[model samples]
Target chain A: LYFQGHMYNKTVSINLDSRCNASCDHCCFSSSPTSTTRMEKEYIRELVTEFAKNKTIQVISFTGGEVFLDYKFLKELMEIIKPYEKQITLISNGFWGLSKKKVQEYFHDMNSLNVIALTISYDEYHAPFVKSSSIKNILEHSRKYPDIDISLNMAVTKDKMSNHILEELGDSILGVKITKFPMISVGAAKTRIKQENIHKFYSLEDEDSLHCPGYAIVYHHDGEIYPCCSPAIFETKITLREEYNQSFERTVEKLNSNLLLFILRKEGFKWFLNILKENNKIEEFDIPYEFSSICGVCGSLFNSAEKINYFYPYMEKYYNENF
Target chain B: YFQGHMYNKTVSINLDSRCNASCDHCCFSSSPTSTTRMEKEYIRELVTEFAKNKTIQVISFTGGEVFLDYKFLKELMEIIKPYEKQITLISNGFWGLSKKKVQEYFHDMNSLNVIALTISYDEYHAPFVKSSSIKNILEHSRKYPDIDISLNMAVTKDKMSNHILEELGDSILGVKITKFPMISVGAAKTRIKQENIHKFYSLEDEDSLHCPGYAIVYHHDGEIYPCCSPAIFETKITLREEYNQSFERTVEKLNSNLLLFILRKEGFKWFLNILKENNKIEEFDIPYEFSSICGVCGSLFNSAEKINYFYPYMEKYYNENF
Candidate 1:
């Protein structure tokens, strides 16, 4: 994902694999079982080393198909992030690597890594495959590690169960906020979903009014930078070079150029490449809510930017108090 | 003399000939030459004849200056009281018509009729009188229930005069400001000499269209003009004739001449005679710039057809009392 604009305190999310265990209705990246696309470990290591030198790269998230499926690669990536003390979050389907034997084998190594939390995806489609009982088993096992935070990420769907489902799930799992899924243009959702069924996602008023904090920066395994995880496939393909110093400059330059321009322009695509060279000051990377309405898409994009911007302050507060 | 609508039971009483002070902008054709008027019997007969028409409701007293001729007005009011009609008096609020005079007038006014008094605190004339006198009249007039008193301020081109005049209007409650456009042919025209003819003759503000409320029926010198100020020296248009002559025939002639002027401007002169014959001269909705052709006096004259449409309402009211 060639994610456009502002790389101050940028964190990259690298998609290690494309194969997913379950096929959800509104999956934007079109992840499915038996998918051939898989990112090599060498490419992942190269991007991670390149991103490490970036003073802005603080928290890197591992996402897609199911990052936990590529356990070996995640372990290596976590080791790299651990040395740099970057907060690394892993997003998973909760169906994988949750047995008592698996936890015992990886617990000591996982404790050594800077793994902050594991966000488990749960919804109607995913719920059927990974039963509630199974999720409890995973949570129980995750509790033994004590260092890792386990969060339940439930997608709100059109199914009749979704109405009271969020409240029920929140009561069952403490400290877990259900992420409401906005429908994407692509995926199985584009076909099977009726217009009325998907109206909730299409309506602009349904989105929350929170400003998107532009904190986290996402970098795919293939060396593409994306602004948010929702538009994972549509990355701003400004490659991160192998040399640490050059890659840091290139990443920062590209992010600063794109984001500053993106924020100022009325429409995103209108000034995608018209980056002004004078506005390169790193301290001026503040993107306010006034620029948030420029995007033609859903308000969730602003919320995502808000989360990315605030992620550093949160992490810093966590580190100063915890460590 | 022709009159379309009349307060049938009432007649305006002229009280005085001697005006203590004269203003350059006087609109009533009042001068030193005009005598302190109307004999007691003449007023009594006028009242008696007016009272015969049960439709007449109000008797208004105006003047060269009414307060100077106050004694005759009081006696006239007493004579007309038995007829059960209302009486209204207009004055310059001078001489002794202050608190004490108001109390004296209230005694007769309460028994006879409802009284209304207007005080003119015009700017050009204000310098000749003291401000304390004006204030005294206002303070005393408030005590009487019979007196429906109001201040009438006049506006002219003099900026200081206009500003002070408006300020007085704001200071006093229930004060009505009458803006008089300076016409060229009056004593005002000579006293308030004009360097530019347009300044005195033309409307001060062109944008404000004149409504019917701006037009006043002033019967002075045995003739009534659409407005007293504009036609101080001009020929008065007649609205009434003998009962046998028929008002419709007279109105037809008046409208025919107006329509000829209208049609000539529109280049539709061929339909002029047809329109006059059909008695639908008002079908011409001519634009404002063309109003001069028909000599339509004010903005409300453009809505003359609307007035004619309410003719039945006027006739019914007139017949009910007259």
Candidate 2:
């Protein structure tokens, strides 16, 4: 019975496509309109069918370059996942909000599909391409569907945080839930922004102490399975699908068995730092004194094959003792 | 990969033959004054060649204490970093007394592919090493979570039931504690006058199951042996004559020997049964029980008489098998 304790919660995050209408410079997936990559529909149905069978799964979240771009395809995708009646969270840049008619129709369709929440990704990087008017329209029209919880997710870089970008929202987003965090240094941000500026953007947040918001299995756009929703440039090293080629259930079993993945999902970086300190290994590697965000901290620790392999035995010992 | 087969390809390198503590039961007889440390350039060339062997999975470093020459170990670790092989370090936790110093050392090693850091912490190791030193090391283990920490505890029959041992074991918290009977070799043999007989426990209690000695040990004498057991000095086989000699030649010579091949490939249990099956067991006085597989090997191959009588028959068996 203790074995099932390590199994993650029934939350599946599906990355629908790599193509997005707005190419935010700090985009974690490096998704853009120019990017044409998308998950095969057949595979999505195959994936959703297995997920639908798992009654324990209570929520399913969808995100992409723009999940709403192909409305017909999106509708088709929704129908297969509809059987489960799970809470659905869809993330977007609110580009469709520009047209009131389009927004109204899309909301009605999504409301019928049991979409429970809408998260609009709006920040300094998204400002140029995704007009503020589009965000305003989405917020104004979302009131019509009281069942849907709407929120604004903003990535606060040094410039954006200093400029008080939230004030620009004015009365339109007064009652709206706003989530603001430091810009992570990954994907496009890695090359676009200077390292010094990224550090400057970081708040004095103790990411090490932050309780990892439970575990989730991420379905990447290219048919890969990630163990966390933490923003990191996609690498085959951490992908569950790359390591285990099996049924969905067997894959989850094997994924839980992986100590590295298990610890990353459960304990996070603070636990890793503690393991290092106890072994007198704290000085063995160069760990930066500060981090821009949790994902950025993860990037520093596990971005390379050597680091991942090095941490294997420690995690193995931990798993043996605790799990 | 041969699943369930004991196909461990490991290399245990003696980084140095000096140590800060000369414990009474020191298996290697390492001490503060003991010399014959490996040169930095020699290690670089040796490790570079080891990195080329795909079969080699683990590369461990031991010393009178490895931290005595921490800089050299760091240099050696840097060369082995790109290979992504399992890196292990064996030491006495004397250097862990200072938190800042330990932090500095861990910071340097954190970037490398180090997996295990086994520190000796038994009654014999307590005189020269402070209990706080091991505590310091354990305290800092939380900061550098990548390296697995373990204690190499040497116990005697009386010490086995002692409260101090339990205290030490309990002190480790979640860290691995490997408690083994004190091997009556090296300093224990010369100074403590302990017998090499396995008499501490009931015959049926001990596990004489497998020969956990697959690692090839490179000694300070410029020789490589089949294993790193404390009784390794008694073994007749030296895979090489000198350190600068061919690496593959040593491996070939190792395969040439039948007993070693069986011990490495099959296990100590299997090899002993093979001798018993041939009715060659009566000539040599084999014990009814052994504390460890290594102990069985040491007893079987300790003297010249046993080696002299068994040589031709071993060769016969070697030829028959090959």
TM-score, B chain alone, candidates in order? 0.61, 0.82
* Model 1, residue B272: C-alpha shift (Å): 99
- Give the per-residue Cα lDDT of candidate 2 at B129: 84
**Per-residue lDDT tens digits of candidate 1, residues B69-117?**
5676667777777777787876666653355765565556566775677
Residue B162 displacement (Å), model 1:
78
- RMSD, one per candidate, in order: 37.1, 22.8
User: What's the TM-score of every candidate structure?
Assistant: 0.37, 0.50
How does model 2 score by TM-score?
0.50
lDDT of 2 by residue, A1-323 (tens): 35545366567788888898888888877888789677777777677777767767777888887888877877876787787687788988898988999898989888998899988888888888878888888887775565787877777554554233444443345335655556566778889877666643222144433334445788888777877787753632666785423456655666777777567767766776666667765456555566654455565566678767878787778868984
CA shift of B16, model 2, Å: 1.7
Share of reference contacts kept by candidate 1? 0.00
State the lDDT at B189 in candidate 1: 48
lDDT of 1 by residue, A1-323 (tens): 87754435556677887788877766656677877665566767877776665566777777888776767877877777666788777788777544656656555565567677777776675765565655655654554454576666554333422433333332233223233343443456557566444323112231222222243455553345554554522522223343533354565566555533334232232121112113442123322223112222322222345423533453345447653
DockQ of 2: 0.01
Best by TM-score: 2
Query: How many residue pairs clash (N, CA or C atoms closer than 3 angstroms) in each of the candidate models, in the order given?
Result: 33, 32
